[PDB]
DNA sequence: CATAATAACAATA
DNA sequence: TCATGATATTGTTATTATG
DNA sequence: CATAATAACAATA
DNA sequence: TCATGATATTGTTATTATG
């Protein structure tokens, strides 16, 4: 197995820091370099074992969530500099009990929600505003308008995003598109890896189909187009929280902060209350809308979280 | 750890199919007899791992589920004779292959349902047999009556279940009761082991507390109460499936036939449709009603199998 | 001259 | 189902003994 | 004399 | 989220350099 190689991207990234004229050090990128060197023509696995041990040591105070996602970033650097078959792969892992706790906490939190249902009551109020945004001549505007209408995620819809328009018989479909560029896949077997499937949408079909050629043919638009999730995240991901916070300040219900996978949620929320065949359950639809795993019932269970004033209403008249 | 001990149940069973009429030779019994026996005196794990190959060698023409079933068997006649903390327990299980098959397989079948859910078009006269069980004197009738009017396991029914009044502010609840005696909890923490929880009925409580009454003070209802279940299913499991085939054959979706379990799914989907409050989802309200685990959403997903004719009419005209 | 009884066999939650 | 490696339930069919 | 920028820090699906 | 031991996304705040 090789014993020599260099995480190419960590390096390229703190050598951008070193001429950055504001902002934090990047201490954590530089204790992953580091790391990664010393492991250069390391062969003995109790010396492999004392490198993680102090990695591990320096990360104590910080959040399980954390660690958990600082342990990925080590992880993926020892693949990047010496590939999937190197024997540190085995020991720089989370303890189990680590991720076990993860997941109870992930289930609980995910089952307060169930209980507790938000009501979304000016719900149409805020996909007006989306609707609205899609006209925006600020392609960030655009790209939310799409978010709340084709209910894709940020990151697909600015970076990879691929909407066609569906065919209804001999027609084209008014209600639906046909979307491809699935994220967070990692490639599954079962997964919309590199398929073109049928979504549903919030408002006409050739207005949302309209302002996304706006979106990819301006400027900023393609300066996102097949844009890496790192640099989408450090362009666009404070500006765009800022100005979801803004847009929707006033009419987002009360209980929770107005966020862009906020309208994600929704999203789902409303496509079920319109769009669903009456042989399909709600975690079913979910699961096909949001282009979720094969015969994965379980993932939809996170985005259900609102409750429409209108199925409120009548479950309360239903005594 | 002891290396000397008898699984007494096992044996128990086989000694009175000694004097039976008919039927087949209790040839699995007996190999978990014999297994147990050789076992005395063992101690090296060489020798256990030896005879349990031998036992998984005879197995292998079953079905996969049969073998996951008979793991099970053995398991528990080791608990009894040896204890908890006996080595064999380490060799004799499935392997780590066999129970990720399982439950890929099992996930399938369910994903497969909420894809196509069948509609139970004459539920309210499925429905209404039940109720009018309540009134019968045999008291298989009532369980059956109370099955699908409580919702509740037959072996509960039957068994062990204990329903009281439910309390509403100072009066008593009409469309609900308190029960105890939840089976499958495995004694867990989060679980409803030994824990009262109120439940709704599908028909007045006070019709449901007064059948139930009928059916513990009848002749067959002291037998039945405080059984093992495997007792139970020995005494009335065919005779009960029998009579549930014949009270439905011609009201039940064609797609499948009556099952006692039916009832159960049915309960769900007919409670949740009637009294459930619009802060709740139908995975959080199917949980709580069936008794399940804390924070767990997903033994739910199995109960899902029906729609209700009402909700399928405007699911349709919902354009 | 065949059918009730039993436990194996199996699947579900 | 509780727990995430299995158990406790429910559901189906091949054997057996029997005037 | 303080605020824009950056990556750490963190949580969700 | 895909897989059931973790990764790839989204979301929040402490540091830093700077006329
Ligand atoms: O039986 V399952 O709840
Ligand atoms: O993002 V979750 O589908």
């Given at each position: 197995?090789?014993?020599?190689?260099?995480?190419?991207?960590?390096?390229?990234?703190?050598?951008?820091?070193?001429?950055?004229?504001?902002?934090?050090?990047?201490?954590?990128?530089?204790?992953?370099?580091?790391?990664?060197?010393?492991?250069?023509?390391?062969?003995?696995?109790?010396?492999?074992?004392?490198?993680?041990?102090?990695e591990?040591?320096?990360?104590?105070?910080?959040?399980?969530?954390?660690?958990?996602?600082?342990?990925?970033?080590?992880?993926?650097?020892?693949?990047?500099?010496?590939?999937?078959?190197?024997?540190?792969?085995?020991?720089?892992?989370?303890?189990?009990?680590?991720?076990?706790?993860?997941?109870?906490?992930?289930?609980?939190?995910?089952?307060?929600?169930?209980?507790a249902?938000?009501?979304?009551?000016?719900?149409?109020?805020?996909?007006?505003?989306?609707?609205?945004?899609?006209?925006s001549?600020?392609?960030?505007?655009?790209?939310?308008?799409?978010i709340?209408?084709?209910?894709?995620?940020?990151?697909?819809?600015?970076?990879?995003?691929?909407?066609?328009?569906?065919?209804?018989?001999?027609?084209?479909?008014?209600?639906?598109?046909?979307?491809?560029?699935?994220?967070?896949?990692?490639?599954?077997?079962?997964?919309?890896?590199?398929?073109?499937?049928?979504i549903?949408?919030?408002?006409?079909?050739?207005?949302?189909?309209?302002?996304?050629?706006?979106?990819?043919?301006?400027?900023?638009?393609?300066?996102?187009?097949?844009?890496?999730?790192?640099?989408?995240?450090?362009?666009?991901?404070?500006?765009?929280?800022?100005?979801?916070?803004?847009?929707?300040?006033?009419?987002?219900?009360?209980?929770?902060?107005?966020?862009?996978?906020?309208?994600?949620?929704?999203?789902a929320?409303?496509?079920?209350?319109?769009?669903?065949?009456?042989?399909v359950?709600?975690?079913?639809?979910?699961?096909?809308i949001?282009?979720?795993?094969?015969?994965?019932?379980?993932?939809?269970?996170?985005?259900?979280?609102?409750?429409?004033?209108?199925?409120?209403?009548?479950?309360?008249?239903?005594?």
């Open positions: 197995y090789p014993k020599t190689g260099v995480a190419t991207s960590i390096v390229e990234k703190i050598e951008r820091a070193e001429f950055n004229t504001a902002g934090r050090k990047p201490t954590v990128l530089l204790r992953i370099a580091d790391f990664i060197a010393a492991m250069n023509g390391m062969d003995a696995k109790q010396d492999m074992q004392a490198l993680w041990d102090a591990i040591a320096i990360m104590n105070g910080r959040a399980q969530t954390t660690i958990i996602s600082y342990i990925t970033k080590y992880r993926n650097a020892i693949r990047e500099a010496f590939g999937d078959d190197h024997p540190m792969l085995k020991i720089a892992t989370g303890d189990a009990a680590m991720y076990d706790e993860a997941r109870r906490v992930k289930m609980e939190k995910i089952a307060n929600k169930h209980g249902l938000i009501t979304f009551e000016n719900y149409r109020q805020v996909l007006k505003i989306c609707e609205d945004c899609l006209k001549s600020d392609p960030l505007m655009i790209g939310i308008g799409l709340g209408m084709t209910g894709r995620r940020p990151y697909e819809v600015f970076t990879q995003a691929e909407f066609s328009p569906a065919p209804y018989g001999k027609g084209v479909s008014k209600w639906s598109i046909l979307f491809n560029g699935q994220a967070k896949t990692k490639q599954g077997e079962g997964t919309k890896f590199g398929i073109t499937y049928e549903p949408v919030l408002t006409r079909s050739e207005t949302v189909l309209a302002a996304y050629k706006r979106l990819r043919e301006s400027g900023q638009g393609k300066l996102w187009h097949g844009m890496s999730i790192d640099d989408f995240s450090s362009e666009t991901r404070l500006l765009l929280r800022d100005t979801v916070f803004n847009l929707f300040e006033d009419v987002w219900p009360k209980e929770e902060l107005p966020k862009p996978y906020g309208l994600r949620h929704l999203y929320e409303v496509a079920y209350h319109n769009f669903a065949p009456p042989h359950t709600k975690n079913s639809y979910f699961a096909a949001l282009g979720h795993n094969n015969n994965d019932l379980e993932t939809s269970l996170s985005y259900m979280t609102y409750t429409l004033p209108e199925d409120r209403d009548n479950a309360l008249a239903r005594l």
